[model samples]
Target: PMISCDMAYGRTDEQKRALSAGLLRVISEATGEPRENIFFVIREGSGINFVEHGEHLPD
Candidate 1:
């Protein structure tokens, strides 16, 4: 499983990058795995579209 969180306030571009890198390293270390074996995915988006229908009807 993977864990993700919202960005913190008051972070400059450099700080944000460092924070992201540090978090990845710590999690990998805690799991007894190498950082190279772990993957970090960051999705930056403004909006998401959701479908309200639960089922489809055949015409």
Candidate 2:
């Protein structure tokens, strides 16, 4: 299975790695898929890269 995380900008690779590890565990156990077979898409974006938001402005 694949997962895409659309999150706000400003997270370190260290954090992403940690997040992926944790999420992979969840996905692996939940879906009964091999952890190595699972994939992660971490594409961070800012307000400028989006369409519309409430109070979050583009940087």
Candidate 3:
């Protein structure tokens, strides 16, 4: 299965790498698929171009 995650922009490259691996580990186990067969994608942007509650992004 393809796993897609939308996150607010702020994490450093190293932090992203760690999260990627960690995500794969747990996802693979949960899905009963091999880690090598799992795919993960994380997209980020300035202000994340997202909104929450009373906030808006890309200002």
User: CA lDDT of 17 in candidate 2?
Assistant: 92
lDDT of 1: 0.58
Cα lDDT tens digits for candidate 2, 1-59? 99988877888999999999999999999999999999899887887676655565466
Model 2, which residues run further than 4 Å from truth?
A: 48-54, 57-59
Candidate 2: the clashing residue pairs are none
lDDT of 3 at 1: 69
**Clashes in predicted model 1:** 0
* TM match of model 1 to true structure: 0.47
Give the range of the ten consecutive residues with the poorest summed lDDT in model 1: 43-52
Task: Extract clashing residue pairs from model 1.
Answer: none
Q: Where in model 1 is the C-alpha error above 4 Å?
A: 1-16, 47-59
The CA lDDT of each predicted structure is 0.58, 0.87, 0.83
**Clashes in predicted model 2:** 0
Model 2 quality (TM-score): 0.78
By TM-score: ranked, best first = 2, 3, 1
Q: Candidate 1 lDDT, tens digit per residue, 1-59?
A: 36564432344779767867897788888998777776665543222222225532222
Q: For residues 1-59, write the lDDT of model 3, one tens digit per residue.
A: 68887878888989998998998999888989998898889987777477877687753
Model 3 bad stretches (over 4 Å):
57-59
